[PDB]
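Budget justification note: compute hours in this period were largely spent on complex prediction jobs such as the one shown. Inputs:
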Amino acid sequence: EKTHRWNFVEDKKYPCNETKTMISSRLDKVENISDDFLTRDIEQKIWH
RNA sequence: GAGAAUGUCGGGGAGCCGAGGUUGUGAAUUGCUUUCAAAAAUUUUGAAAAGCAAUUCACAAUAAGGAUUAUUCCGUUGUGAAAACAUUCAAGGCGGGGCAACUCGCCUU
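Corresponding output:
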């Protein structure tokens, strides 16, 4: 904080792909799976 | 000035449902008025009917009307003479979703 600023509103948050990240959280909580089942195809499907 | 992304404040349109109210029918109870209709001393009481009601319940309709049997609707909007429109609108295929009806995406004219 003490030396740099990022040219955007200092106290504002900006969207960072909520969809995939929240899918990742819900796919993490289920467990009992390999940590590779989340790919482009699976993510787009479950989104649909 | 234009364009895209992110938030804030408003507006418009469409849709799925709910509870009353009102008018009318039927009923339970109780009234005001009038006539029949008897008794009694112009007046008081009793039977019946009608008019108007009140409290509660069930039901019918809720813009007059016109479709249709899809678990679908059109009727208070705008334009304007055509009483004609607008407010829904193609073909396919490649998929996701369900008991399936049906719903949701992608691809080329």
